């Protein structure tokens, strides 16, 4: 039920029987594979499921959120001991960026935390563009020029 | 060795499925045409399509003076270092220039040389020559092998 | 009063169509009490465990085949999950399946007026199943794609 912002019942109905059914298809698969490797056979590891809620949400941005979770799960070689996974009503949990995401800068920030900088006739131009772009790679800029405006 | 100690890296670092991102090619030298050719139809049975030619390949020469040095060793000095690079070029260039992009990076040398500056470098007159001889390669073919190829 | 199965929370071998079902109907049971509170109706569910039966004795050989153990250790299993000793009828303690007696006095306790506060809760005549109620968690964090490779 990538439904939101209403509430439901038949989602939770859905959700306690899916759960229960990758509960179960899980002890099947691993006891099977057990099985197979007591045979020698090579067979496919044991099927690996889990569930993701999303009425819980009450933002716009959960849908993104939901799909990047369920990529991850699907092609990552992470695991997830339990089975439900909610979202929180409010993606306040990390610091926030709506898409976070990764484009654009991720090569670039944490380079040159620590240090300070300053540049001269930063007002527009290269100088615009290095003193934004050294100050996302987390050091403290000191932007110098002379028509405020554009400085501010 | 090297591809067990990238690979047990690659895993490290979550990366997924590390024997398939990187191959090896041994045996390869690159003192021979027919061997530069073996190597071209092995990178693209493997991966396909080339994007990067890291043309890095160089021995020291000779080692010699100018005066004690025989014509068959500049003539290996000159395969090694100089002529591999254009065959591998014209090797990979077709198809860096049917999907519109590529790149060619020679390893040069500081002891070789500049434009309008030249460096002297006794005992390794087949190194320095060679190095020079790459890199106006580069220079010269920035041209023609635009704006589909990049080298450098 | 609805009679639904503690084994609709556990790892209940070769029975989907009997176990999923009956946790929806556990969630059925929690909206239907909702819902019927305001009508002024009583709703209560019990969580019977396995009840001295031929019944339950056959499930458990059944379940020892499928799993391809030998007979008696799911009546083992779930007999560790007790906590509790009834006196059998020689004095003795021992671990023992609940009787249909129980069942019935926890249900003319619900059905009854003396149960009047009671709504939409649960009790497990099962000797101190220690079952997990639930497997949850919540996604805090976003996620990590760039070392995501889906090839293929």
Redesign the interface.
């Known amino acids: 039920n990538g439904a939101d912002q209403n509430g439901n019942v038949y989602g939770r109905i859905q959700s306690a029987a899916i759960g229960q059914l990758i509960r179960v298809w899980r002890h099947e698969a691993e006891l099977d594979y057990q099985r197979a490797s007591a045979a020698g056979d090579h067979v496919l590891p044991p099927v690996w499921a889990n569930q993701i809620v999303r009425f819980a949400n009450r933002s716009l941005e959960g849908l993104e959120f939901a799909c990047a979770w369920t990529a991850q799960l699907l092609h990552s070689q992470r695991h997830i001991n339990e089975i439900t996974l909610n979202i929180p009503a409010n993606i306040s949990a990390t610091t926030g960026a709506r898409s976070a995401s990764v484009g654009w800068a991720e090569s670039l920030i944490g380079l040159h935390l620590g240090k300070v900088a300053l540049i001269t006739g930063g007002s527009a131009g290269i100088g615009g563009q290095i003193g934004r772009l050294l100050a996302l790679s987390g050091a403290r800029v000191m932007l110098a020029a002379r028509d405020r405006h554009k400085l501010e | 060795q090297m591809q067990a100690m990238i690979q047990s890296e690659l895993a490290e670092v979550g990366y997924t499925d590390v024997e398939d991102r990187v191959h090896i090619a041994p045996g390869c030298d690159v003192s021979s045409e027919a061997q530069l050719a073996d190597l071209v139809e092995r990178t693209l049975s493997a991966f396909g399509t080339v994007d990067y030619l890291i043309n890095n390949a160089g021995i020291a020469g000779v080692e010699e003076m100018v005066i004690d040095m025989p014509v068959e060793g500049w003539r290996h000095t000159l395969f090694a270092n100089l002529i591999s690079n254009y065959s591998l070029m014209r090797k990979l260039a077709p198809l860096m220039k049917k999907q519109g992009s590529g790149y060619i990076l020679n390893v040069s040398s500081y002891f070789g040389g500049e434009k309008d500056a030249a460096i002297p470098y006794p005992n390794r007159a087949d190194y320095a020559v060679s190095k020079a001889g790459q890199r106006a390669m580069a220079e010269v073919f920035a041209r023609f092998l635009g704006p589909e190829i990049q080298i450098n | 009063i609805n009679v639904s199965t503690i084994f609709?929370?556990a790892?209940?071998?070769?029975?989907?169509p009997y176990?999923?079902?009956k946790?929806?109907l556990?969630?059925?049971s929690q909206?239907a009490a909702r819902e019927l509170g305001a009508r002024g109706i009583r709703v209560n569910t019990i969580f019977p465990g396995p009840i001295e039966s031929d019944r339950i004795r056959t499930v458990f050989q059944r379940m020892d085949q499928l799993?391809?153990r030998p007979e008696g250790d799911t009546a083992h299993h779930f007999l560790n999950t007790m906590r509790l000793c009834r006196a059998n009828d020689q004095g003795a303690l021992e671990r023992r399946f609940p009787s249909v007696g129980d069942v019935a006095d926890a249900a003319v306790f619900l059905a009854s007026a003396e149960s009047a506060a009671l709504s939409g809760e649960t009790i497990e005549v099962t000797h101190g199943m220690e079952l997990p109620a639930?497997?949850?968690?919540?996604?805090?964090?976003?996620?990590?794609?760039?070392?995501?490779?889906?090839?293929g």
């Open positions: 609709s929370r790892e209940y071998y070769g029975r989907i176990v999923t079902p946790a929806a556990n969630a059925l909206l799993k391809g639930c497997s949850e968690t919540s996604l805090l964090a976003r996620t990590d794609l760039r070392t995501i490779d889906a090839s």
